[PDB]
Nucleic acid binder design. Structure first.
Ligand SMILES: [Zn+2]
Length: 271
DNA sequence: CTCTTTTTTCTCG
DNA sequence: GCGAGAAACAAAGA
């Protein structure tokens, strides 16, 4: 999922597993643990979960005083808290067993990843990933944002998806943000004027914070953490091909931009 | 049966 | 370094 969905899962996990001692850890797909499954199992078994943080679309389990399990859900990763006797589901890959339940990770496409690193390696880890600022008024500086946009010829949608200008936007929210800011996805960033960049900046923050408040977008659902989201009922363009724009009434169109499905209003978002 | 569609990171030119 | 295309992988629809 995107930042809102990951934050939703983070909040649920924080509320339910913090303080839990990991009894055992099993894997049917050990290869998704990029730092080595057996090594992770040896290091984390018997340890207690102290907290759950997030950076961009990355989940950060704080286990023991020196361990950090970095988890990325990628396209389809899903977590669920189940009973110890819960039957296995086809795409379940890993499980963290507690005394009165277990945290199961499932991922149909097997894109999701787990990486075990030390507490002091977290900041360097994200610096290496070149992740941009969190989408908040406090961390997302419009001035630097503007300067980077002015220096580039990249198209705005692909550039925003890079996670370098700001962290957290995925295909759904980048489409929603550009529609809200009335900017065409193929617009070269150096062509954006100051007022448009200002609207874009605030729209990125507003859309994501709203999505977080509503528990993310669940255009699917299911017995999993963060599956009761209501943001999907607020989407203005994503997956609305053929429907009418809520502002002007023109039909929402869908095109391909840098290989990604792209939804936009041809009237509100002039090319 | 073929082709298309649905986050991150690499190859190629 | 950059843009285009694709891979990792599974499933469902045209
Ligand atoms: Zn419109």
């Amino acid at each position: 999922g995107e930042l809102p969905e990951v934050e939703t899962v983070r909040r649920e996990l924080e509320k339910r597993i913090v303080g839990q001692k990991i009894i055992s850890i099993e894997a049917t797909y050990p290869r998704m643990v990029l730092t080595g499954f057996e090594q992770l199992k040896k290091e984390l078994t018997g340890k207690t979960i102290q907290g759950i943080s997030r950076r961009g679309k990355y989940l950060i389990f704080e286990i023991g005083d020196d361990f950090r399990l970095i988890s990325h859900l990628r396209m389809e990763g899903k977590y669920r808290l189940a009973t110890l006797d819960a039957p296995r589901e086809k795409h379940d890959h890993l499980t963290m067993k507690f005394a009165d339940g277990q945290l199961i990770y499932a991922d149909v496409r097997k894109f999701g990843t787990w990486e075990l690193i030390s507490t002091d390696q977290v900041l360097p880890y994200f610096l290496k990933k070149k992740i941009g600022p969190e989408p908040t008024y406090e961390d997302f500086d419009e001035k630097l944002f503007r300067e980077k946009l002015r220096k580039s010829t990249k198209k705005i949608k692909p550039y925003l998806l890079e996670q370098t200008l700001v962290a957290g936007l995925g295909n759904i929210y980048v489409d929603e943000v550009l529609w809200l800011a009335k900017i065409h996805p193929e617009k070269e960033t150096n062509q954006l004027i100051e007022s448009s960049i200002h609207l874009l900046h605030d729209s990125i923050i507003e859309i994501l914070q709203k999505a977080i408040k509503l528990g993310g977008s669940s255009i699917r659902t299911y017995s999993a953490l963060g599956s009761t989201g209501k943001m999907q009922n607020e989407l203005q363009v994503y997956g609305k091909t053929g429907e009418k724009c809520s502002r002007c009434g023109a039909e929402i169109q869908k095109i391909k931009v840098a290989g990604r499905g792209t939804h936009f209003c041809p009237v509100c978002q002039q090319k």
